[PDB]
Amino acid sequence: MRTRSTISTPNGITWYYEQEGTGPDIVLVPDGLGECQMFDSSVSQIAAQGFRVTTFDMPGMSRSAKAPAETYTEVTAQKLASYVISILDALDIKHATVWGCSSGASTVVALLLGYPDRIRNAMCHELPTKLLDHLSNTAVLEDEEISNILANVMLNDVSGGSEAWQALGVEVHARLHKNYPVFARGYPRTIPPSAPVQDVEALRGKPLDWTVGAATPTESFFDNIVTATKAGVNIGLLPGMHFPYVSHPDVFAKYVVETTQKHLWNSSS
Amino acid sequence: MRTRSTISTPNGITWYYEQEGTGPDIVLVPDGLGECQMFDSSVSQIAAQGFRVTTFDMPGMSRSAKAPAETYTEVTAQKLASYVISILDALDIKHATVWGCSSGASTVVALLLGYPDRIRNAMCHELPTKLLDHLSNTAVLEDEEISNILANVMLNDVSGGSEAWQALGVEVHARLHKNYPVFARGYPRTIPPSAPVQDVEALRGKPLDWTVGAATPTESFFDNIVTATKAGVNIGLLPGMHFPYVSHPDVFAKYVVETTQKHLWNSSS
Ligand SMILES: C[C@H]1CCCC(=O)CCC/C=C/c2cc(O)cc(O)c2C(=O)O1
Ligand SMILES: C[C@H]1CCCC(=O)CCC/C=C/c2cc(O)cc(O)c2C(=O)O1
Ligand SMILES: [K+]
Numbered sequence: 077m078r079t080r081s082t083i084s085t086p087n088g089i090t091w092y093y094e095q096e097g098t099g100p101d102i103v104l105v106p107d108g109l110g111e112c113q114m115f116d117s118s119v120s121q122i123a124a125q126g127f128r129v130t131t132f133d134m135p136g137m138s139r140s141a142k143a144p145a146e147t148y149t150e151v152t153a154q155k156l157a158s159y160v161i162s163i164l165d166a167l168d169i170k171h172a173t174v175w176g177c178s179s180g181a182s183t184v185v186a187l188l189l190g191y192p193d194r195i196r197n198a199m200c201h202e203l204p205t206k207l208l209d210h211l212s213n214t215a216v217l218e219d220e221e222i223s224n225i226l227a228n229v230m231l232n233d234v235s236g237g238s239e240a241w242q243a244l245g246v247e248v249h250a251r252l253h254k255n256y257p258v259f260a261r262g263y264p265r266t267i268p269p270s271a272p273v274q275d276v277e278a279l280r281g282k283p284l285d286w287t288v289g290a291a292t293p294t295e296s297f298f299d300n301i302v303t304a305t306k307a308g309v310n311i312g313l314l315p316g317m318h319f320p321y322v323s324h325p326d327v328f329a330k331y332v333v334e335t336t337q338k339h340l341w342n343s344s345s
Numbered sequence: 346m347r348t349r350s351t352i353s354t355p356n357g358i359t360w361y362y363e364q365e366g367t368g369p370d371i372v373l374v375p376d377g378l379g380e381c382q383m384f385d386s387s388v389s390q391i392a393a394q395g396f397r398v399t400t401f402d403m404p405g406m407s408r409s410a411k412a413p414a415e416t417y418t419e420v421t422a423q424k425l426a427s428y429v430i431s432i433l434d435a436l437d438i439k440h441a442t443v444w445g446c447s448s449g450a451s452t453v454v455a456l457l458l459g460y461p462d463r464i465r466n467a468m469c470h471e472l473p474t475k476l477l478d479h480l481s482n483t484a485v486l487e488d489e490e491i492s493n494i495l496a497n498v499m500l501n502d503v504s505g506g507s508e509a510w511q512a513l514g515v516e517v518h519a520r521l522h523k524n525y526p527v528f529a530r531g532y533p534r535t536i537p538p539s540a541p542v543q544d545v546e547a548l549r550g551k552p553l554d555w556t557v558g559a560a561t562p563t564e565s566f567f568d569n570i571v572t573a574t575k576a577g578v579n580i581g582l583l584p585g586m587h588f589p590y591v592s593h594p595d596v597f598a599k600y601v602v603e604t605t606q607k608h609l610w611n612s613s614s
């Protein structure tokens with residue numbers, strides 16, 4: 077029942093995308109590694125509740141590698157939001173619920189603020205707002221060293237579930253191996269300063285649901301909790317750390333379905 | 346230069362206390378384990394900046410164990426605050442800066458709200474507001490089983506630094522071993538409901554500085570970050586987890602000195 081295909085947008089990107097289901101649109105935006113096979117189990121569980129679920133590899137990453145250099149260098153939340161609107165236009169998705177973690181969280185908040193007509197509600201997880209010099213400094217290393225460093229960081233530090241991370245399988249980890257240097261060179265120096273959470277008053281009253289990983293060290297996304305609270309935005313926890321859709325796919329799917337259902341009820345009111 | 350002595354209060358407690366320095370008073374209230382040797386390094390560093398620093402073992406714990414059963418059973422923040430005021434009265438400390446972690450955090454917020462004339466400013470760290478059934482249920486075990494389990498929890502789950510925790514040494518750990526059953530049967534069921542942070546407007550504008558451990562899992566004190574932000578209370582991080590005075594004594598001492606200095610400036614202004 078899963079469609080697995082490609083589509084070309086006039087910004088030069090040939091996207092790899094997947095779709096499953098019929099009903100209101102839910103769109104799952106990857107984190108900065110840009111790999112949508114991380115959503116495989118959750119896509120089926122969400123679509124089974126009466127939704128059309130779309131996800132895709134991000135430009136320059138995995139199976140969406142046929143893209144111009146400006147789509148995967150000096151990457152900002154605003155650039156990524158423009159690229160997601162281009163694929164939603166191409167797939168004739170006029171109204172969508174959106175999920176994103178990390179650079180995907182920055183993307184979905186930029187989509188909600190920038191394209192309010194198009195976005196029913198946004199779920200953002202672990203949105204990066206601070207530069208991390210130790211991450212930024214990987215960008216000048218050789219490709220094989222970047223891949224070794226970041227593969228180990230994902231497995232041992234931020235997966236929230238090493239057994240689930242390994243169980244993504246050989247083909248996914250071979251794609252991620254090639255993405256690590258693209259991500260290192262294009263994301264960490266430019267994504268955090270582009271975070272669309274400068275203006276707390278712009279967030280107030282918006283259909284935004286924000287999460288942090290329960291096991292994530294407090295310091296990592298402390299600022300997300302403060303910002304959401306100041307803006308009166310719903311803020312809570314998912315199990316695990318930076319990849320709840322990998323570590324806890326059934327909890328993740330249930331969260332996405334229940335949050336979408338809450339906004340469908342409120343919108344009809 | 347350090348006083349190490351005992352003093353009896355009319356509520357029946359014989360306190361073990363320490364004192365060092367001259368200048369404005371800073372009082373360091375222990376966490377639920379009630380062991381003031383955890384402050385030893387920091388007492389000297391804070392006192393050397395021009396302050397009189399006082400600390401003590403808590404009633405029923407360590408060298409303050411000669412105390413009525415009411416002082417270490419069905420313990421609440423408001424009971425602990427009344428006991429701390431009794432020792433400050435006995436030592437002729439009229440106006441104090443106070444620090445506390447855990448049940449000590451609940452105590453110092455109860456002190457600031459209940460005795461505003463006596464408290465210059467309060468620093469609270471990791472204030473427990475939720476019941477933890479796994480902890481409350483230790484109370485029905487045998488004393489040696491409680492001590493074995495909670496010694497392991499302290500080292501591996503909340504110390505924030507296994508080397509510094511073990512380096513407290515045999516004398517300290519032997520006193521903690523006797524305290525674990527007293528803590529387990531007195532604190533976990535009654536401390537969290539007594540948390541004096543249910544009235545958010547009562548906190549607004551108060552001379553309160555709140556911290557959580559940087560390495561603490563986000564879920565542990567997520568509610569502290571939300572509550573402080575809603576009240577407009579200064580909220581930030583210290584390195585480590587539940588015992589920054591053990592894991593990072595020099596950073597802890599600097600934080601206590603700087604925060605006290607900020608309130609001395611603001612008091613004069
Ligand atoms: C790729 C994924 C795993 C990156 C995981 C990682 O490096 C741990 C720190 C959490 C920050 C992630 C991150 C930071 C940025 O500055 C820019 C980003 O796009 C991300 C991000 O997308 O997270
Ligand atoms: C020292 C540590 C002991 C117990 C430390 C522990 O097991 C987890 C620390 C988080 C909560 C601690 C705590 C919880 C309560 O319900 C009541 C308390 O008095 C505390 C408390 O004092 O913390
Ligand atoms: K699950």
Ligand SMILES: [K+]
Nearest residue numbers: 593594595596
């Ligand atoms: K230190």
